[PDB]
């Protein structure tokens, strides 16, 4: 009598009952945990999401065509996790952490659960450190701090991704520097996009020498719904590695509209009844638990942080809709972009009234706060008065002044792409406007003036700019020096 083969018992393994649309229903697996990774005989992985009396509903991390009824499924013993660490920097990986850039295995030495709960109340401290985008309009009006979540939201082709790209590229001046604490490691999560678009993107980041401090997590349009669903949580864990180890990371989720669509798909196929707009009832929680994980840690937890810029695509400009407001109701503010603004020449196409930062000047250097502190409310009142004054007849001194200022500030917050600005340069430029030195300059000349002014202070007053950058403020001396530069230069400019 020979020994029986026990390799295939129904506690540690199972057999496929049915398989369709990326859902395997599995007999056995009596010892599996909820949210455990399992393995199919074909080498495919999957996640145990439904534990039922007579079956496990398994969600497949890949193509389901190799799965057949009766196939063997094995426990891994492990709650779904990803590789994590600095080894990921400069690499493009899939939602599971596998290299897809053709550059060989990631030699990562640590792993991390994708579903870890966001830190609670005690491990954190108030967001206080600037996360500079280098975009004047963001950094002045809707400033972002380290540990903050700030939403990028708007219709197709309004400039959402470009905000994120410019922000990543901007970090090179800190990352090439010698102040370790100012460095910011970047993570770009692509969800639902076409592969060739992600490739153009990393090509842009490479040419900008920004790949070297960026991880690209890609779950694109032909990747299975569970992969797209997981990608943000995978990237988040990769980001949490810096957060918990005294470093600072930035994560972009591009985009969460497409992720919520993949979650919808996956939930429907699991037979979980649809809710509003056919999304599951807990589509808020899908994103809430994700973004809560962007956080600023206190010194006892290392003082590190993770900052998040999730992206949401609206339809027909409606930021008030169900899904958009769900995500707005999570983040510490939103940058709302509109086509109308975009085509009128307001680029970046930020709607000031509808955008906010929920951290405010706490996230700004003192110098920026000095120039930008009241501008956001001021610009809101400006736009209102400009609409009310529309029928041009007798306007008092106060509103005419409000109008002249407003129209000129609007020109100053216009900005091109791919050259994010050093904070002190942003301050010098905004300064000329908020202090009124441009109030009699023709508004159409403002952009020509800024670029000439900037090249002048950069070449001629590197010491003034140095002092503002280093001091983090405009001293009485710096103020006196700036006034003398802009008044006399403008006069030259206007000759």
């Amino acid at each position: 009598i020979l020994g029986a083969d026990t390799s295939v018992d129904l506690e540690e393994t199972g057999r496929v009952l049915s398989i369709g649309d990326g859902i395997a229903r599995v007999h056995g697996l009596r010892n599996v945990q909820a949210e455990e990774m399992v393995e199919f005989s074909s080498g495919l992985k999957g996640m145990s999401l439904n534990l039922e009396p007579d079956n496990v509903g398994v969600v497949v991390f890949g193509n389901d065509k190799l799965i057949k009824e009766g196939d063997i499924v094995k426990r891994t013993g492990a709650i779904v996790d990803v590789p994590v660490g600095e080894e990921l920097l400069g690499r493009v990986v899939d939602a599971l952490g596998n290299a897809i850039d053709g550059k060989g295995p990631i030699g990562s030495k640590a792993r991390r659960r994708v579903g870890l709960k966001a830190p609670g109340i005690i491990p954190r401290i108030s967001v206080r450190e600037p996360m500079q985008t280098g975009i004047k309009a963001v950094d002045s009006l809707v400033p972002i701090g380290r540990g903050q979540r700030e939403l990028i939201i708007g219709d197709r082709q309004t400039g959402k991704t470009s905000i994120a790209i410019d922000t990543i590229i901007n970090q090179k001046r800190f990352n090439d520097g010698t102040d370790e604490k100012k460095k910011l490691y970047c993570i770009y999560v692509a969800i639902g996009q076409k592969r060739s678009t992600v490739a153009q993107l990393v090509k842009r980041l490479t040419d900008a020498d920004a790949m070297k401090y960026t991880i690209v997590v890609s779950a694109t349009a032909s990747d299975a719904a569970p992969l797209q669903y997981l990608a943000p949580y995978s990237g988040c864990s990769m980001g949490e590695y810096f957060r918990d180890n005294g470093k600072h990371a930035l994560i972009i989720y591009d985009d969460l509209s497409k992720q919520a669509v993949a979650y919808r798909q996956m939930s429907l196929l699991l037979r979980r009844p649809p809710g509003r707009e056919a999304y599951p009832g807990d589509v808020f929680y899908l994103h809430s638990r994700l973004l809560e994980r962007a956080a600023k840690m206190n010194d006892a937890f290392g003082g590190g942080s993770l900052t998040a810029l999730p992206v949401i695509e609206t339809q027909a400009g409606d930021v008030s809709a169900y899904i958009p407001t769900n995500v707005i109701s999570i983040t510490d503010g939103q940058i709302f972009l509109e086509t109308e603004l975009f085509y009128k020449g307001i680029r970046p196409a930020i709607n000031v009234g509808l955008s906010v930062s929920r951290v405010g000047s706490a996230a700004q250097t003192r110098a920026m706060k000095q120039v930008a502190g009241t501008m956001k409310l001021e610009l809101a009142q400006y736009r209102e008065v400009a609409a009310f004054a529309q029928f041009g007849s007798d306007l008092d001194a106060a509103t005419q002044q409000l109008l002249s200022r407003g129209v000129r500030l609007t020109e100053l917050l216009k900005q091109g792409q791919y050259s994010p600005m050093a904070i002190e340069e942003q301050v010098a430029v905004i300064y000329a406007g908020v202090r009124g030195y441009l109030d009699k300059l023709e508004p159409s000349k403002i952009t020509k003036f800024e670029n000439a002014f900037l090249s002048h202070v950069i070449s001629q007053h590197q010491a003034l700019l140095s002092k503002i950058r280093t001091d983090g403020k405009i001293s009485e001396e710096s103020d006196a020096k700036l006034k003398e530069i802009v008044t006399n230069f403008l006069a030259g400019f206007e000759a």
Binding site: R30, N31, V32, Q33, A34, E35, E36, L49, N50, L51, E52, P53, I79, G115, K117, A118, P119, G120, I121, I122, R124, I125, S126, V127, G147, R272, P273, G275, R276, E277, P280, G281, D282, F284, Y285, S288, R289, E292, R293, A295, K296, S320, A321, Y322, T325, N326, I328, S329, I330, D332, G333, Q334, V356, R358
Partner: protein
């Protein structure tokens, strides 16, 4: 009595008992977990099986895992020992300052005060906020609601109210963070340490904190409002005192209920909501009240989905 897990799908766990079935609302304790995992009984499904909502994550649960009936609903610490502390849904400290050494506990589920317990006294509570004071003033011991869509200023307003009214308040306050930002909870906490309404060194704290935020699964968010409310009820009744109750945000109780509703087997009502929306809100809201025994001035932030007040 011992039971066993027979199904897990998200926040909803089914548990079979061979002997005595735990009544609806009972807290069940999941065995073999690192941190306390409570399941609350929602329905008796028949065949000795109960349907429960979990108070924490269900990851790692295994079909067959043991569950003990505690014999009562979720019971939490109430009393002066809650002052200056942070508690979670199930009354565990989450401020890292050790045990909450109360003489007494209370179930988070209770009957609402009777009609004969009602008070009709109403006098102005001045806020120092022009638009509130002029057009729609608050009343001491009254029920105040702050409605707004995402990012219109509910939380800034409640914090201004805490700043203007609660800092110089003579009695106790409870703040219940319900399904909101953890960041905001850390902000408020350290702000209140700074102003001295929370004191980590003596017994002069005037505010109890109860938090279950949007990093939490729906069970925690659907019950954490009751935890906060139960704390305020003790102060109201077992001290007869003037209590301030701030809740941000009470919508998240209703939303949490909507997240589990399909898994609890309901046909949806309109706009994707549970059919029980109004009675659920009613049994909770009717406890948030001044009575003849004592006064609660309640201020509740009320989220407005898709900016639609309807």
């Amino acid at each position: 009595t011992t039971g066993r897990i027979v199904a897990v799908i998200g926040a909803v766990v089914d548990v079979q008992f061979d002997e005595g079935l735990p009544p609806i609302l009972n807290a069940l304790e999941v065995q073999g977990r690192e941190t306390r995992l409570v399941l609350e009984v929602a329905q008796h499904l028949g065949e000795s099986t109960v349907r429960t909502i979990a108070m924490d994550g269900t990851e790692g649960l295994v079909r067959g895992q043991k569950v003990l009936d505690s014999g009562a609903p979720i019971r939490i610490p109430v009393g002066p020992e809650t002052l200056g502390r942070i508690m979670n849904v199930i009354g565990e400290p989450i401020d890292e300052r050790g045990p909450i050494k109360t003489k007494q506990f209370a179930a988070i589920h209770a009957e609402a005060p009777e009609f004969v317990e009602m008070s009709v006294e109403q006098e102005i509570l001045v806020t120092g906020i022009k638009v509130v004071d002029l057009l729609a003033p608050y009343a001491k011991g009254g029920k105040i609601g702050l409605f707004g869509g995402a990012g219109v200023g509910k939380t800034v307003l409640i914090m201004e109210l805490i700043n203007n009214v609660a800092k110089a308040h003579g009695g106790y306050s409870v703040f219940a963070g319900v399904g909101e930002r953890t960041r905001e909870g850390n902000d408020l906490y350290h702000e209140m340490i700074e102003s001295g309404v929370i004191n980590l060194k003596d017994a002069t704290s005037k505010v109890a904190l109860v938090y279950g935020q949007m990093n939490e699964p729906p069970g925690a968010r659907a019950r954490v409002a009751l935890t906060g409310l139960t704390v305020a009820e003790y102060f109201r009744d077992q001290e007869g005192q003037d209590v301030l109750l701030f809740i941000d945000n009470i919508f998240r109780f209703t939303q949490a209920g909507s997240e589990v509703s399909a898994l609890l087997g309901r046909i949806p009502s309109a706009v994707g909501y549970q059919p029980t929306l109004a009675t659920d809100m009613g049994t909770m809201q009717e406890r948030i009240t001044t009575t003849k025994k004592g006064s609660i001035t309640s201020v509740q932030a009320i989220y407005v989905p898709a900016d639609d007040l309807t």
